[PDB]
């Protein structure tokens, strides 16, 4: 209870076994029409077509060059966060800097596994009386398991009225799960999101989010 159980802090998703990882030729990556002279080229308020489709601008082709603000996953531009111990929800994540509405908070990084491996790892965890799951569905047949290996995003708890959301983006021709702010978040505030249908294994865990509209479940 002094420190969270050991995990491998990794920078990017790690395929495991028979999980495939797509990658894109420039042919397959869209090109925006921002200009280097725009106020915040490819920025959150811009009309960047790439941004609007949840695509990163690729740096070798973005007409805004080095000023492009649409590479938040690639450059890993995470606001400063600290792991803290909550009351009833185990370990939590909070921000040490102010975050503006819509700003990129983090990527949910971990091991990529299939239905069979995810089932296996859930069975093992139950038999050992484990209630902490880090499984988040990437697409129809791949699951992020931030349990063994992950980054700071793995400590973000569920809340039924959250202050961040997940968004599925395309980066170098593959899906990445991003956390983005639903509103302005003041420094020291806990970063949560609604698990909705995306997280697995939580089953009958009783929600302790403390939100007025709390369903008593972690999404489902």
**Residue numbers 11-40 binding its own copies by CB under 8 A:** 27-28, 30
Q: Does 49 bind its own copies (CB under 8 A)?
A: yes
Residues 95-134 that bind its own copies (CB under 8 A): 115-116, 119
Q: How many residues bind its own copies (CB under 8 A)?
A: 24
Per partner kind, with CB cut-offs from 5 to 8 A, the member of its own copies, ligand SAM, Zn ion, none near residue 132 is ligand SAM
| Contact window for its own copies (CB under 8 A) among 5-13, 37-45, 51-59, 179-187 | 51-59
> 64 or 146, CB closer to Zn ion?
64
In 3D, which of 176, 107, 112 has the Cα closest to residue 148? 112
Q: Which residues bind its own copies (CB under 8 A)?
A: 27-28, 30, 47, 49, 52-53, 55, 115-116, 119, 137, 140-141, 143, 166, 170, 194, 196-198, 215, 219-220
């Amino acid at each position: 209870d002094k420190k969270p159980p050991p995990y491998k802090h990794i920078k990017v998703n790690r395929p495991i076994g028979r999980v495939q990882i797509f990658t894109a030729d420039l042919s397959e990556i869209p090109r925006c029409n921002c200009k280097a002279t725009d106020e915040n080229p490819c920025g959150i308020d811009s009309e960047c077509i790439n941004r609007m489709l949840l695509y990163e601008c690729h740096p070798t082709v973005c007409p805004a060059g080095g000023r492009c603000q649409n590479q938040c996953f690639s450059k890993r531009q995470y606001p400063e966060v600290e792991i803290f111990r909550t009351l009833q929800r185990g370990w939590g994540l909070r921000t040490k800097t102010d975050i503006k509405k819509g700003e990129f908070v983090n990527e949910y990084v971990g091991e990529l596994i299939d239905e069979e491996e995810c089932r296996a790892r859930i069975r093992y965890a139950q038999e050992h009386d484990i209630t902490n799951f880090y499984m988040l569905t990437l697409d129809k047949d791949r699951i992020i398991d931030a349990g063994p290996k992950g980054n700071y995003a793995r400590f973000m708890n569920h809340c039924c009225q959250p202050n961040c959301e997940t968004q599925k983006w395309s980066v170098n021709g593959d899906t990445r799960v991003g956390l983005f702010a639903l509103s302005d978040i003041k420094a020291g505030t806990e970063l949560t999101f609604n698990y909705n249908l995306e997280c697995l294994g939580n089953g009958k865990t009783v929600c302790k989010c403390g939100a007025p509209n709390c369903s008593g479940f972690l999404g489902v």
